[PDB]
Each structure stands twice: as structure tokens, then as C-alpha cells.
Design an enzyme around this catalytic site. Sequence first.
Site: not given
Ligand SMILES: C=C[C@@H]1C[C@]1(NC(=O)[C@@H]1C[C@@H]2CN1C(=O)[C@H](C(C)(C)C)NC(=O)O[C@@H]1C[C@H]1CCCCCc1nc3ccc(OC)cc3nc1O2)C(=O)NS(=O)(=O)C1CC1
Length: 197
Positions: A75, A99, A155, A157
Site C-alpha cells: 500500500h 500487502d 510512515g 510501515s
Molecule cells: C499508523 C501507521 C500504520 C503503519 C501504517 N499502516 C496503515 O496505516 C495501514 C494501511 C491500511 C490501513 N492501515 C492501518 O493500520 C489501520 C488504520 C485504521 C488506518 C490505522 N489499522 C487497522 O486496520 O487495524 C486492524 C488490525 C488491522 C487488520 C486489517 C488491516 C490490514 C492491513 C492492510 N492490508 C492491505 C493489503 C493490500 C492493499 O492494496 C492497496 C492495502 C492494504 N492496507 C492495509 O491497512 C502506515 O504508517 N502506513 S504509511 O507508511 O503511512 C503509507 C503511506 C505509505
Amino acid sequence: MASMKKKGSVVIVGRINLSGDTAYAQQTRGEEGCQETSQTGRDKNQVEGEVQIVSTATQTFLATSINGVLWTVYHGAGTRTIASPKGPVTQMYTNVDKDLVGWQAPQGSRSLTPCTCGSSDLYLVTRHADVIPVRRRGDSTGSLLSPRPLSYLKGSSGGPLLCPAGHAVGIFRAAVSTRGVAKAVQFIPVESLETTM
Ligand SMILES: C=C[C@@H]1C[C@]1(NC(=O)[C@@H]1C[C@@H]2CN1C(=O)[C@H](C(C)(C)C)NC(=O)O[C@@H]1C[C@H]1CCCCCc1nc3ccc(OC)cc3nc1O2)C(=O)NS(=O)(=O)C1CC1
Ligand SMILES: [Zn+2]
């Protein structure tokens, strides 16, 4: 259709240094430079370390080298290439269901090794080199010992979660939060990395 463009490559703009006394983030490419290295793909700056800071023209995140592969998250990267001295480089692993994406670990770099001694209390490295104690509460989940806002985990991840020895246990992927205060985290267990390989 002639005046069309293409989503540039992922560019290495820095690193999280961990090979000494303290952990601290180092920048290696500016914003105006990264905006160019993504349009060309020719990255001349050599690579060092394990955790790299990567950026696209619109986002920014981390990437961790493990078992000779620079892993990150879909993502943030998508199907984009990465800027190497020999031009762009196609991912050798892409699994949207997880992911997860990966490139061959560039030369001059080091790759962590999966922890095989059983991780009990993990340590999450953030975008700002912070090392956050995590209490492994699952196979791909871990609660935080100290509460802090989601804004300090964005940021991050693609970063590493590490054994107390320093081996790699997973790849930070998502955050569990309530009322804007992050309470737990989820990661890609390093065993699934091996399975993809
Ligand atoms: C706060 C920092 C955090 C580390 C970060 N990750 C996220 O924000 C993820 C992205 C997305 C939503 N995320 C979340 O963390 C959510 C949120 C409510 C948003 C906090 N939390 C959540 O669901 O709780 C539940 C247990 C999980 C299980 C269910 C979620 C499964 C995870 C996931 N899988 C896929 C597969 C394929 C795809 O194709 C497009 C897209 C996906 N997107 C996903 O999550 C980050 O910083 N990113 S970033 O660096 O800024 C980015 C700009 C580069
Ligand atoms: Zn270990």
C-alpha cells in the site's frame, strides 16, 4: 496517449542507522533530488545498513532488508520499481493479499536474519529511529507498553520488529488505535516472508 506519464520508482532517501551506540535516522537524498531519482530510476548513492527510508512522489515509508531481499509494503509501494545504479528494478515478490513486496537487497547493504530463538518482547523501529517496546500478543500482533498517538507511527510501515537480540520478527503493516491513541500493532510475520520465498 503520447502525452502520458508513468508512476516513477520507489527511491531510497535515507536509512535508520542501528549499527552502533544509538539508533538515529540519516537523510541521503533531498526532496528535489528524490523527485528526480524517481523519474529516472538511476540511483547512484550506495546503500548501507538494514532499514532504509523510501519515498514515492506522494508518500513515504520504510523498507527492511531480510534474507537478502529488501521488503516493504504494497500500500506504500504498489507495483513500482526501485531506483538502482543500473536503472529501475522489478520486484521479485508481490503479494497484495499480504500487502508485501520485495526487491533484491542492493549491494553494499546488510540483511537481518529471522529470529529463531522465539521472540517474547519485541521492539518496533519507527520512521524517526525510535525503538518502541512491543509485547507480542499474537502471531502477527503486538500491544504497546507505552501509549502514543497514531501520528508518530505513520510512515513507519515496512519497518522492522526485532527480537531483544536484534533479529527480525516481522514487518510493521498496520496499527490498532482507539480515539486516536495507538494501542497495538500488527506486522507481517517473518515466517510468511520465507514462505513467499
Ligand atoms: C499508523 C501507521 C500504520 C503503519 C501504517 N499502516 C496503515 O496505516 C495501514 C494501511 C491500511 C490501513 N492501515 C492501518 O493500520 C489501520 C488504520 C485504521 C488506518 C490505522 N489499522 C487497522 O486496520 O487495524 C486492524 C488490525 C488491522 C487488520 C486489517 C488491516 C490490514 C492491513 C492492510 N492490508 C492491505 C493489503 C493490500 C492493499 O492494496 C492497496 C492495502 C492494504 N492496507 C492495509 O491497512 C502506515 O504508517 N502506513 S504509511 O507508511 O503511512 C503509507 C503511506 C505509505
Ligand atoms: Zn532472535
